[PDB]
Tab-separated table of C-alpha atoms in Angstrom:
chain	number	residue	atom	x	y	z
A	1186	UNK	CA	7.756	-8.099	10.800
A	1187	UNK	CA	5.548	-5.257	12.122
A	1188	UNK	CA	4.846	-3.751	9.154
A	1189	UNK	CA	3.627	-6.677	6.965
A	1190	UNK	CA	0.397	-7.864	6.478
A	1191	UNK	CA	-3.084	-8.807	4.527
A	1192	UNK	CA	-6.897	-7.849	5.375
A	1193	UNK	CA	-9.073	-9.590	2.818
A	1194	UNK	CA	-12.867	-9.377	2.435
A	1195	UNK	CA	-15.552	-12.043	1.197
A	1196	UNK	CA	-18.904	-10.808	0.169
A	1197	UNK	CA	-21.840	-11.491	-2.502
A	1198	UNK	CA	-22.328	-9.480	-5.741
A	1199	UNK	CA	-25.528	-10.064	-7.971
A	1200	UNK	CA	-23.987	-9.865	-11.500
A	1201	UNK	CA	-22.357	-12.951	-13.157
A	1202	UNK	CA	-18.613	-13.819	-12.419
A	1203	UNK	CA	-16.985	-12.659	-16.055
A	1204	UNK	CA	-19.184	-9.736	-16.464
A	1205	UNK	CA	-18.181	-8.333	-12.794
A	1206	UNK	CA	-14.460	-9.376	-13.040
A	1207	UNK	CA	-14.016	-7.658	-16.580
A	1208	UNK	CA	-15.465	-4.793	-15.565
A	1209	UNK	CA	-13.320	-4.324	-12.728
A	1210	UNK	CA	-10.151	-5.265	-14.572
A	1211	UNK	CA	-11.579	-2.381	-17.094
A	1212	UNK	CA	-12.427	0.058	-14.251
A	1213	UNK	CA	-8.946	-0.027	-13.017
A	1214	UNK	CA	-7.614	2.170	-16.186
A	1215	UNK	CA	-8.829	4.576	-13.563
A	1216	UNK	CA	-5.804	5.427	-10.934
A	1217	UNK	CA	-7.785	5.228	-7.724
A	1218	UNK	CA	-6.696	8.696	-6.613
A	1219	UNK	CA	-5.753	12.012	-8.465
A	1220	UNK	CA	-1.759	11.380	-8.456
A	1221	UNK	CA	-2.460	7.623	-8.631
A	1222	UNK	CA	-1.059	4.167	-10.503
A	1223	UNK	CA	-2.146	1.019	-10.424
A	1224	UNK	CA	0.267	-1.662	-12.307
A	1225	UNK	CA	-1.278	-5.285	-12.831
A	1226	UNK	CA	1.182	-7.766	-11.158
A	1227	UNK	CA	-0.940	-11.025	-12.375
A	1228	UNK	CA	-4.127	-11.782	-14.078
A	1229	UNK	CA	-5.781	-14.458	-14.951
A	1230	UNK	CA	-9.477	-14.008	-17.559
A	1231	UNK	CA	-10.582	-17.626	-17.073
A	1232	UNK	CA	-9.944	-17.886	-13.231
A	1233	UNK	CA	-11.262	-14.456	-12.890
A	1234	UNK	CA	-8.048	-13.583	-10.816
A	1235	UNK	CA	-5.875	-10.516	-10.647
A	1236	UNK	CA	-3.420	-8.668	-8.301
A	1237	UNK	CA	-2.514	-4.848	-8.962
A	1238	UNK	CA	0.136	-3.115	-7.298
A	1239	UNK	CA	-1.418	0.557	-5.988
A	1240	UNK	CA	0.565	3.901	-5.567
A	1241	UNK	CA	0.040	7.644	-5.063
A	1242	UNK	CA	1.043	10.189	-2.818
A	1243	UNK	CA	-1.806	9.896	-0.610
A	1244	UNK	CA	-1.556	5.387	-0.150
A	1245	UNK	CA	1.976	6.349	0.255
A	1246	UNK	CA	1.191	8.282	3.136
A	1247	UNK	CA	0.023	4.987	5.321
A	1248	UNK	CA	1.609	1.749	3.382
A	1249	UNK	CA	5.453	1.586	1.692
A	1250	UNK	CA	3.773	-1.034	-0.657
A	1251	UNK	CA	-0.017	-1.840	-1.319
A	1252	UNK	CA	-1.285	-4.899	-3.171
A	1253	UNK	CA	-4.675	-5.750	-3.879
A	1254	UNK	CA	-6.218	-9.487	-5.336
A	1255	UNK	CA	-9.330	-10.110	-6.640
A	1256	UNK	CA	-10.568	-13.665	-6.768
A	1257	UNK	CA	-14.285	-13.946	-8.398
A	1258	UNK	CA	-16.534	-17.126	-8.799
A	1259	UNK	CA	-20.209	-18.239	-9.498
A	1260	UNK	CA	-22.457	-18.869	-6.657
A	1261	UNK	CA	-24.512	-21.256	-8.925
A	1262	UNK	CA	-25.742	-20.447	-11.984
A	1263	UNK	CA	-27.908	-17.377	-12.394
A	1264	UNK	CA	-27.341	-16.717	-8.787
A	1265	UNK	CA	-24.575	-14.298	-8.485
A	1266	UNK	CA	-20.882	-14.165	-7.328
A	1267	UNK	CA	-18.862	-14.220	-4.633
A	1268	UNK	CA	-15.822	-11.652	-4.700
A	1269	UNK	CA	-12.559	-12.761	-2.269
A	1270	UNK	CA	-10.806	-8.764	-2.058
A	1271	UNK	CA	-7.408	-9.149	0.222
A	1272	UNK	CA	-5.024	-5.898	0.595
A	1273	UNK	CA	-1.324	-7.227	0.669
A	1274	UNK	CA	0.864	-4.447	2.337
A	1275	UNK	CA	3.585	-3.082	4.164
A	1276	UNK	CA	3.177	-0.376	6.253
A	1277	UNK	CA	5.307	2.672	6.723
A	1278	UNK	CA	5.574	2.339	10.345
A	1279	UNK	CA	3.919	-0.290	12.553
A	1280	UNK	CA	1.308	2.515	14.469
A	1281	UNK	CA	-0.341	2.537	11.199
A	1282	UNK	CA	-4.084	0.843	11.181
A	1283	UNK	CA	-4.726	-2.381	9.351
A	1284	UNK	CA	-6.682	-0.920	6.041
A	1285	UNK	CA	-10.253	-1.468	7.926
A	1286	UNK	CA	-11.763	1.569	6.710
A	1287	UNK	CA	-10.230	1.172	3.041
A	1288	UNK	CA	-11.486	-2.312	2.733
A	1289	UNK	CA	-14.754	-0.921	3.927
A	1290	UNK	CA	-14.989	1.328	1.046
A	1291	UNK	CA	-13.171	-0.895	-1.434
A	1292	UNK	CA	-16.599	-3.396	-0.815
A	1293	UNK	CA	-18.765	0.015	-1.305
A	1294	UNK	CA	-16.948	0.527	-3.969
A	1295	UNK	CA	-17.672	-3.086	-5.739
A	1296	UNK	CA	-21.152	-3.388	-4.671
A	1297	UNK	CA	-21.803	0.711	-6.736
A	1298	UNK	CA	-19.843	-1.414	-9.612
A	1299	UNK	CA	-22.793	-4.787	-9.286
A	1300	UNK	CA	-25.331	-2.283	-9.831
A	1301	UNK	CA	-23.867	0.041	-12.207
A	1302	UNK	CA	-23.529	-3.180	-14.552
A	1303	UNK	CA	-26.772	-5.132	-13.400
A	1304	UNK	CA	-29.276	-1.998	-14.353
A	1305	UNK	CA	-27.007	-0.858	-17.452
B	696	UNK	CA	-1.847	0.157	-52.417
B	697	UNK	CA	-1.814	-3.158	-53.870
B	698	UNK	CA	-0.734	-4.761	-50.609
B	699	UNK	CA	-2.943	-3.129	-48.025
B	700	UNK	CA	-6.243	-4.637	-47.149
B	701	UNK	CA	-8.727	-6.321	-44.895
B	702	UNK	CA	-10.932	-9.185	-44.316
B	703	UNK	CA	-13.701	-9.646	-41.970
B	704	UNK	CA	-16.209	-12.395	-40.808
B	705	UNK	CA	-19.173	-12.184	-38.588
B	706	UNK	CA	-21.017	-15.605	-37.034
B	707	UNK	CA	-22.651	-16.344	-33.728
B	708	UNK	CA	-21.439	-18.066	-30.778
B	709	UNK	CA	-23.657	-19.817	-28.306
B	710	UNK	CA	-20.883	-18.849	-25.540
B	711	UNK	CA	-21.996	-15.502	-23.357
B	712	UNK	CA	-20.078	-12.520	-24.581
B	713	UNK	CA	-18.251	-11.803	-21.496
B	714	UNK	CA	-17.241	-14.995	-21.204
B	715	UNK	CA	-16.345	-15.940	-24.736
B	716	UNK	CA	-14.445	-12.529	-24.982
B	717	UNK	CA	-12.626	-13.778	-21.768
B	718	UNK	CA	-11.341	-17.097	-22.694
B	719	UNK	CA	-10.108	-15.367	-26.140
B	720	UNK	CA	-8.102	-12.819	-24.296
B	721	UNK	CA	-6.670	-15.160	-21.940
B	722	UNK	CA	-5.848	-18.104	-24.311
B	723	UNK	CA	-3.716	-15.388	-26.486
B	724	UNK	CA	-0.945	-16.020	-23.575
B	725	UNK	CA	-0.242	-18.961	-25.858
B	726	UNK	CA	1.352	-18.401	-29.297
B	727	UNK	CA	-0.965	-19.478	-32.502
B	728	UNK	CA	2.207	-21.034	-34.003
B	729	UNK	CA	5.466	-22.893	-32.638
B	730	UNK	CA	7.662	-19.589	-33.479
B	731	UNK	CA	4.297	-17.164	-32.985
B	732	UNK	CA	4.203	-13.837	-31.291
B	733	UNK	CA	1.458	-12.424	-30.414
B	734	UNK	CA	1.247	-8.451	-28.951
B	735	UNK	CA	-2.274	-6.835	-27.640
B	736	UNK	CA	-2.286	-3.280	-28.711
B	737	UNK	CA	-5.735	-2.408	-27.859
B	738	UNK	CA	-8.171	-4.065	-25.432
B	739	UNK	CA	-11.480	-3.383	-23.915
B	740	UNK	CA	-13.612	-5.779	-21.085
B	741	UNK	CA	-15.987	-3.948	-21.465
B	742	UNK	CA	-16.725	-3.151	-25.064
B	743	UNK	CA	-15.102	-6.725	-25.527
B	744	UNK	CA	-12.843	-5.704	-28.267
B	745	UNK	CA	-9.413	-6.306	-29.271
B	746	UNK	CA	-6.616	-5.805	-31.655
B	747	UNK	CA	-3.606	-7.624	-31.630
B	748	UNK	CA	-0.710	-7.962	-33.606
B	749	UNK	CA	0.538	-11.286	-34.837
B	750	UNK	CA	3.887	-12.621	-36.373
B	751	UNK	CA	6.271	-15.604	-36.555
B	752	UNK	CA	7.814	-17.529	-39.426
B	753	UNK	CA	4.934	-18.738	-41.042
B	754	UNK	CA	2.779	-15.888	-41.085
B	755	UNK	CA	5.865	-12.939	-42.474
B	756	UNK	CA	5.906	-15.737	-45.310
B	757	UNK	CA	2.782	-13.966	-46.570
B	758	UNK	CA	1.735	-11.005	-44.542
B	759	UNK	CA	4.399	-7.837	-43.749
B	760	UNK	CA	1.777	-7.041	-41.019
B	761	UNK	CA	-0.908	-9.036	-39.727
B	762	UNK	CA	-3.155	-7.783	-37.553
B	763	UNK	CA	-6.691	-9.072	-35.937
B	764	UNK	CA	-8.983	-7.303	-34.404
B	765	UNK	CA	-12.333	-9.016	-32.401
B	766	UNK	CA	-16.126	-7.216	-31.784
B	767	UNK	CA	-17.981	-9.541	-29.293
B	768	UNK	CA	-21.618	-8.524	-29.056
B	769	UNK	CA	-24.665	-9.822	-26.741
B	770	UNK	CA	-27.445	-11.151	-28.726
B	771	UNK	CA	-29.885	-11.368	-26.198
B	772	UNK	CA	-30.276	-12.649	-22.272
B	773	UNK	CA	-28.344	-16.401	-22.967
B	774	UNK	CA	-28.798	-16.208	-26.357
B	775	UNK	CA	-25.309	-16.230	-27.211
B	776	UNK	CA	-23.078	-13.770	-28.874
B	777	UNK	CA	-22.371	-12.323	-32.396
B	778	UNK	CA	-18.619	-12.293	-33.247
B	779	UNK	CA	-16.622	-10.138	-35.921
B	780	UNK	CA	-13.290	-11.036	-36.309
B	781	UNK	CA	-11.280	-9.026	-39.000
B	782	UNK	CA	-7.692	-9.122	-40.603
B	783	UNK	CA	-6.146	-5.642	-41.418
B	784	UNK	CA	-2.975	-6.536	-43.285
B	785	UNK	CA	-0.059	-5.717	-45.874
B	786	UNK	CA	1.056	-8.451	-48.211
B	787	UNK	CA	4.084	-9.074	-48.950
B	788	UNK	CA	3.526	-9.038	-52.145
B	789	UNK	CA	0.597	-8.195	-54.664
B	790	UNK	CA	-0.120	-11.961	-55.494
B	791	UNK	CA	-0.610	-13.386	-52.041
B	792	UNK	CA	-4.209	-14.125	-51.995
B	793	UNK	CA	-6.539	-12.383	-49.183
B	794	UNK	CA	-6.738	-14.517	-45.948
B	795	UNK	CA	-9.410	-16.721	-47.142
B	796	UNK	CA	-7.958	-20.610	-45.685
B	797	UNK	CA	-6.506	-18.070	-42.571
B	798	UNK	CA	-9.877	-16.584	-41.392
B	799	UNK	CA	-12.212	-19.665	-41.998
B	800	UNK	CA	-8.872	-21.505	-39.894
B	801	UNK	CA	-9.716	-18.476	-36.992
B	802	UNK	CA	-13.839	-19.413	-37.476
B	803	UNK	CA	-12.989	-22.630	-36.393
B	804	UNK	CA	-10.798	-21.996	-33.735
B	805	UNK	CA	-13.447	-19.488	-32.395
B	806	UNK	CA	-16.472	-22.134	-32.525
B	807	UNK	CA	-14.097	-24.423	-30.914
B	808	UNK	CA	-13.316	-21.963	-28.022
B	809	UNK	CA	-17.008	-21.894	-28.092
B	810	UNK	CA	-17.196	-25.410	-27.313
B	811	UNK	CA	-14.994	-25.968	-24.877
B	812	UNK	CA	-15.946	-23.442	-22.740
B	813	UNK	CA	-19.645	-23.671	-23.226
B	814	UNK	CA	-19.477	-27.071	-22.123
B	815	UNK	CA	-16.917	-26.487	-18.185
């Protein structure tokens, strides 16, 4: 296919691994845009997994279908987390860019969360 | 009403709250009895609360409704966590004693929980 892919992310976080993933699996009873939805397609508490389906008429504009996984685990103890973030998608025609600058801010977006919850 | 009431216990965990709160949510994918079911109808990661309804067999035996509801609460920085775990319920009838063998049952299965996750 063309239109099929995955761009995924790996970066560091300071807070611990359950504290980061819940708040992130609480966060997202925010849609991620003003006509937005976000349905959880799998998630796991104890593996500190999850994969949300993501709509709106903006998203909509760029991908058919956009999927987004989380995968978070311990660096060591005490020592942070790393955070595996991986857009699944299809695109609505193949002169569409991979999500570069999306993932860009998605990372932004999850390093604002590690210090919203590390200083509150 | 002679069949409304609820019953409530508060202990400590040596388990993180984020993490204890975790495990709980997650291990509620299994039933707490062979013909168990088991429905969330309110959940926070971040406030690390919960209410879910339960029923099967055993439990409509004794209980028209059953609900439990669980406060997990930092005590310090890795000094564990304080837990209150309550039953809201309607008897069946006026004689069925309050929860009492239930709830210490749910104390035990929590300090448990505690212990196995503590310790991986």
């Amino acid at each position: 296919s063309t239109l099929k892919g995955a761009l995924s992310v790996k970066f560091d976080v300071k807070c611990p691994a359950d504290k980061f993933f819940s708040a992130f699996v609480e966060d997202t009873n925010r849609p991620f845009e003003k006509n937005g939805k976000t349905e959880i397609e799998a998630v796991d508490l104890v593996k500190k997994t999850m994969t949300i389906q993501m709509s709106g008429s903006e998203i909509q504009k760029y991908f058919k279908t956009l999927k987004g996984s989380i995968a978070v685990t311990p660096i060591g103890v005490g020592d942070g987390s790393h955070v595996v973030w991986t857009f699944h998608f299809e695109k609505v025609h193949k002169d569409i860019d991979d999500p570069h600058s999306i993932i860009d801010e998605s990372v932004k977006y999850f390093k604002k969360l590690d210090e919203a919850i590390l200083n509150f």
